Amino acid sequence: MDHLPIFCQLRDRDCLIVGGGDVAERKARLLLEAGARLTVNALTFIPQFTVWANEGMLTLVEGPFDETLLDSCWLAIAATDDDTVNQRVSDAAESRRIFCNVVDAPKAASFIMPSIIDRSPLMVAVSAGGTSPVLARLLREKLESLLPQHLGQVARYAGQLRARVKKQFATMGERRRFWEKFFVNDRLAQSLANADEKAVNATTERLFSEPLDHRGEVVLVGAGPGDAGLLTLKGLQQIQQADIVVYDRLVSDDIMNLVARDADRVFVGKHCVPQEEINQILLREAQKGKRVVRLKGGDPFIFGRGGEELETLCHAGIPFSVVPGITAASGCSAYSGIPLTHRDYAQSVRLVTGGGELDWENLAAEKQTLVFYMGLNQAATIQEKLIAFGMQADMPVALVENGTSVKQRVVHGVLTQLGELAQQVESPALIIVGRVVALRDKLNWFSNH
Amino acid sequence: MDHLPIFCQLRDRDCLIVGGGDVAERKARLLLEAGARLTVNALTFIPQFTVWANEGMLTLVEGPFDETLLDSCWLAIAATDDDTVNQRVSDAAESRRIFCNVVDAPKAASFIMPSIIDRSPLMVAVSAGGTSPVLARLLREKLESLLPQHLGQVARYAGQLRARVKKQFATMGERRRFWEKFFVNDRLAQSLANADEKAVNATTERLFSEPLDHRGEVVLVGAGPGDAGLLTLKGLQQIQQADIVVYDRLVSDDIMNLVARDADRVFVGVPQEEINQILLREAQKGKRVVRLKGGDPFIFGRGGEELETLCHAGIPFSVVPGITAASGCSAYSGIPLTHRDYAQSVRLVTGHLKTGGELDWENLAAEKQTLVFYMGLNQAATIQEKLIAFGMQADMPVALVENGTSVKQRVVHGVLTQLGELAQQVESPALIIVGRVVALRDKLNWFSNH
Ligand SMILES: Nc1ncnc2c1ncn2[C@@H]1O[C@H](CSCC[C@H](N)C(=O)O)[C@@H](O)[C@H]1O
Ligand SMILES: Nc1ncnc2c1ncn2[C@@H]1O[C@H](CSCC[C@H](N)C(=O)O)[C@@H](O)[C@H]1O
Ligand SMILES: [Cl-]
Ligand SMILES: [Cl-]
């Protein structure tokens, strides 16, 4: 082992940074977050240091390095651009047995600053001893995506339930299984973060009361339009914790590859399935005590029938939550170079589905961006009706097929060509009508296929 | 943060353990592996301390605590079962400004020892500060199952190449590019694990020979409406690797906590072409620039304007969509934007227009839609009067969602004839939702009522 990681308590302890530029500022922000009683000594200071000083958050000492500034110090950081100054700092700290980091020279000093993932009280630190700072960064990024934002509040609450857990679960078998359900419960972590103190006491009692086996709940998760990079952090966290994942055709294979190895999968796409059967599967699986994730393409509440699936659960007393996703309109817009709004082009964006019938005079009005979902089959009618109701024949149009995916295809033109531009694509595809479509020739950045 | 993690270099540095039982034995093994010059001071010692002392690996001082043994020390560990003695050690260490761990009292004294995942030279340390040892152990086990066992060989080889990388690549941008390729090459990792030096050298020589794009870039990133969990995975990647992040007031503090600590931050919460110049400015200097925008970049965010300069200015760019306020406020208020036959259209509408343009109220008042007004608080009374005048039913439900998706989220709701009054109960940022779907909140609301 090259270095020993320790987690220092710095609250109100004297620490010293030498240097007053951007590098020193980053280290100072870190030590302030840890509560250090901070002095910064430098020949000159960038303005953020005087802001902090005037706010009484640290002390500044302007001038050359004064090794007596270390006399009461617990940690030192040499953060200047001057190798000679940094070695003077490093030597003075060493003679005083003060752990010291030289920012530009990790093996020149007595401690290295790792990458940090802060979920205080829970903390994770990554370092390769200076051999691989980019790898430490790549691991830090992975860990930030995996650890829920409010995990620390759960951790603090856990330590307060320590003794109570021991007495109702004598066997360490059952006991750890409880903690496994506890650090995973969404209503608890939410009630804590939102300071909803009666839900915390409620969910606490429900966690103890219901059988240890049971963790029945349904999370509706928006998978986004296809690119697995467009899943939300929380959506990834939820699919990693699921006992069973219920999904359909519009959830991309790339998203499904992120689903936990041990999760049961239930495919409800597809000859066709009624929504009521899907509703009952969610009900049936949650009633067995499973943590259920219902993965839906795009956003669950935009033409996804997410509401219908949750009203079945509200009847049965099954807890649920919703993780929004990137709807097809947002994803296709970003990846085709067609902003849904721009300057004065559109006062409104309309997301419309292709029962009555569409209000064609309403759809034809000026200063809109129209986005048709499930409209390929009525495309020929859309062209004829918009033309008949006064939309200018030179209005730009675009179709985006498999938006955000590696096989995305975008075709475009004006409105008088829409009907047979639509033959050149298949589902899933969006139709975008409006002046913003012309911006594609300037803003297109994604590969076209 | 509760603690500051640091990785200490203990080679040939004096450390002191007080105590000589099983706890002290565990901690002594750690400090010996780190190369410490170790003294152990205890009334009695378990047999392993004899094995170590006979091999010359540490010094035993058999007897009560001698605080002068701290005089040359860099770290102290109090590992007895006597709380009076442990406190004497911690008091003596504190007077000398020596970081001290009291093993059975994490809240006392000045450092705690984390759980370690070892991929030397790569190491990952985990701790909950003694608050939840079970969570630390659970988290430690998943990190083990995520870090390949050969990652240490990859990091070892990187350290051996660092001097060559600094010599051959003039700029930090080029060196970073090299490492980003180096650390994801699966064949190189396999060749290192197999000690196949022929294959290692072949891949390495090709990596050194590749052109590296000196281009700075601009990425527009949708931060989402506030909950940091609603950042996209790709959006997190961008802000964790950015050189400079340009952000504004509608990006939440929690999202800014995910920006790389070494990134510079530029706040622009300021006219629009002022922002445009900053982006082009910083990208022309070869930096990875992220424009981090509330919600989605291309929905009432002026993202189009921010990009239209860079096309002929020769600067590459890309766009990462985000959760727009309508989608986030919908999910977190229990108000789906569509449902059954309630809405044929969702309309995202701006509430503030050009100094001469006005909304098409006849168009907005039509049935079977969900209206969502962005930046419309100041016009709420006008929205009520106009929607009523163009035929919307007086009892149409409405809701205002303030700071949607954040822990401070507030929702007020009523009917259209109350919209003006309801809007005075909230402040920016808030969304106005108008439509029959608002009545689903009583059944679908899961997040809070504040
Ligand atoms: N990747 C994609 N590219 C283009 N259109 C897509 C798409 N994914 C879904 N769609 C559109 O969405 C329709 C299904 S309705 C489901 C919409 C989903 N809830 C969402 O928020 O996006 C398809 O017919 C198609 O018009
Ligand atoms: N968290 C939030 N809660 C409610 N409204 C929000 C919000 N964040 C942004 N908004 C709305 O968005 C307006 C700014 S316009 C920026 C919108 C952004 N591009 C997006 O896609 O959401 C605000 O005036 C407010 O109406
Ligand atoms: Cl490193
Ligand atoms: Cl802990």
Numbering used by the authors:
A (entry chain B): 1 to 270, 275 to 358, 363 to 457
B (entry chain A): 1 to 269, 277 to 457
Sentences from the paper on this structure:
Siroheme is the modified isobacteriochlorin tetrapyrrole used by siroheme-dependent sulfite and nitrite reductases (SiR/NiRs) in catalyzing the six-electron reduction of sulfite to sulfide or nitrite to ammonia. The C-terminal enzyme module, CysGA, is homologous to a well-studied class of SAM-dependent uro’gen III methyltransferases (SUMTs) that catalyzes the methylations to generate precorrin-210,13.
R260, which binds ring C C12 acetyl, and R261, which does not directly interact with carboxylate but contributes to the positively charged pocket that captures ring B, are part of the CysGA SUMT module. Both the R260A and R261A variants complement a cysG deficiency in E. coli grown on minimal media where SO42− is the sole sulfur source. Activity assays showed that the R260A variant is deficient for dehydrogenase activity and ~100-fold less active as a chelatase. Non-enzymatic oxidation of precorrin-2 is sufficient to support complementation of a dehydrogenase-deficient but chelatase-active enzyme, explaining why R260A complemented despite deficiency for dehydrogenase activity. We next determined the X-ray crystal structures of the variants to test whether these alterations changed the relationship between the enzyme modules or their overall structure. R260 directly interacts with the ring C carboxylates, but removing the large side chain does not substantially alter CysG’s structure despite its participation in forming the active site.
